[PDB]
Design an enzyme around this catalytic site. Structure first.
Site: not given
Length: 264
Positions: A131, A177, A208
């Protein structure tokens, strides 16, 4: 030059929970320029190995990314997983911290008391992360084109323009996601890069956290991350197929690659 380590790879050897080398680890005593670090290293790789630094996402810690440590180290890498100075650090800060962790691995390689004394080729380094840590990895690669490979997972950055990147980059993406949606993050980042070997691998039905510790696709994700780092950090063309090939897998909802040769 190539820096080949270990036996000739097979699908089965790369899909396994561990590679051929015995792994040990330690906590970094006095982290320099980041929050905390665990170093994973092979005791018996049969020569010097490259180093990879792995950064978590916003509010996350080493637990999210820890599975990569043993997985990569067992195939012939020194891996540092970090905690950031603050869980609320942004991608530019996470990049600086990732490079500070590689610098300290290079320091420990020259520290006669360290378990990784003489174990690292400091000219062969890679970056990974989740991320905002994946955004961080792409910033690291843009700023430091001598890096040999990048393999971010579910990357997030407020800019998707990585068009300067010449580092071989594998993007792990998570189909469903909702935090860093593929259509606004992972895929535009992938599409911005016209100067490198690159690959886009989207996990079917993934949330995610689809490439985190405890994920249900460690066989395929592990095989790809290890093959990519072997091919590009070691220049090991025994991994050209595993690195560059479509895995033709029901577990993958989207596969794209460019400038990635199957040749040995």
């Amino acid at each position: 030059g190539s820096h080949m380590r270990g036996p000739n790879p097979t699908a089965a050897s790369l899909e396994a929970s561990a590679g051929p080398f015995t792994v040990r680890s330690f906590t970094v005593s006095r982290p320099s320029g980041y929050g905390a670090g665990t170093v994973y290293y092979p005791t018996n790789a049969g020569g010097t190995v490259g180093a990879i630094a792995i950064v978590p996402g916003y509010t996350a810690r080493q637990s999210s990314i820890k599975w990569w440590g043993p997985r990569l180290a067992s195939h012939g890498f020194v891996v540092i997983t970090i905690d950031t100075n603050s869980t609320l650090d942004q991608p530019s800060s996470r990049s600086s911290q990732q490079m500070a962790a590689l610098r300290q691995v290079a320091s420990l390689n020259g520290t006669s008391s360290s378990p990784i004394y003489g174990k690292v080729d400091t000219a062969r380094m890679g970056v990974m992360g989740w991320s905002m840590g994946g955004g961080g990895s792409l910033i690291s690669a843009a700023n430091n084109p001598s890096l040999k490979a990048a393999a971010p997972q579910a990357p997030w950055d407020s800019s998707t323009n990585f068009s300067s990147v010449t580092v071989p980059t594998l993007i792990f993406a998570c189909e469903n996601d909702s935090i860093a949606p593929v259509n606004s993050s992972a895929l535009p980042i992938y599409d911005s890069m016209s100067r490198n070997a690159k690959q886009f691998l989207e996990i079917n039905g993934g949330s995610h956290s689809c490439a985190n510790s405890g994920n249900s696709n460690q066989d395929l994700i592990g095989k790809k991350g290890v093959a990519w780092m072997k091919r590009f950090m070691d220049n090991d063309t025994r991994y050209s197929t595993f690195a560059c090939e479509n895995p033709n897998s029901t577990k993958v909802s989207d596969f794209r690659t460019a400038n990635c040769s199957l040749e040995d």
